[PDB]
């Protein structure tokens, strides 16, 4: 009496081609860094950091990404 | 009595050439940072960050992205 | 007596050349910063950051993006 | 009583920076040289160059000198 | 009483830039060369050069000199 | 009572950089020589040189001196 097909087709492509790919970081300066503290009260968690240079590099070879979900659902 | 057919095709294409890809940091500074804190009183969580210098960098050979996404529902 | 029927079809495609792809930092400053606080009180969560320089840089060697969504729905 | 307190401070600097230095992308490109040469009669000294790029950095200079004299005298 | 401080303080920058230095995507490009000589006659002393490109840097000069001279004297 | 106290202080800095040093992606690039030579007649001293390119750095220059002197003296 009843029938439900779920036949969705992904044939695509996400691609790169690159030459060289090259990063340079010449000398970075994190200066002086002060902090002082009295009297401070906390009452729920305290996350901190403290620091004269934070880095973060990323540099992959194709950063290509797909994302693909899919639902039947019934309630 | 009843059919439903959800067929969804898909060829698709996300894509890219590249040469040469370059990303040069040439010497920053951050300079001197100085914090004085007294009689602070705080309540709920403290998510802090200090200092000079704070650097992302993201260089991927190819940064592209496909999402898709696909529902059959019933409520 | 019924059928739907739900047959879309992607051909697309988003696209890039490049030659030499670049991006050059030379030398950037942060200046000073101070901060003073004295009796400040809080009560709900408290997010911060403090900082001379603060950098972010996305170079991607071709940045295409597709977002495709697809509903079939009954309610 | 007497008291005599010769102390001088010195943190000068003296630099020199001299020739190529801190060049980015420095691509210089010599094109393509024929020579074609026939039936040349030389009498005296033949001194000869041929080529497509001469990339010379020459530095006789840059030099520093620092003279500096100190004297304490009774007499 | 008698008492007598000398105390000078030197925080000179004496400095000298000389040459190319800090350019960015320099890229000079020599043009094709074509020389043909046929039947020439040099009856005393030749010095001769070809090419596309002469990037030629050149610092005789550049250089520093301090001099500087203390006396504290008593006669 | 007499105290005499010679405490001059030197951090003084003399520096000299010369030459190539700190440059990024420098790529010079000479291109084809073709050189054809046909009955020349040479009856002196030849001195010959081909080639595409003379990558070169050369520093006479650059040198430094620190000429300082002391003296304390009772006569």
Chains 1, 2, 3, 4, 5, 6 share one sequence.
Request: glycine residues 12%; proline residues 4%; positive net charge.
């Amino acid at each position: 009496s009843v029938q439900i097909v779920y036949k969705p087709v992904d044939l695509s492509k996400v691609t790169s081609k690159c030459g060289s790919l090259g990063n340079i970081h010449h000398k970075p300066g994190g200066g002086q860094v002060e902090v002082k503290s009295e009297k401070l009260d906390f009452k729920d968690r305290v996350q901190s950091k403290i620091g004269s240079l934070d880095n973060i590099t990323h540099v992959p070879g194709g950063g290509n990404k797909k994302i693909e979900t899919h639902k039947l659902t019934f309630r």
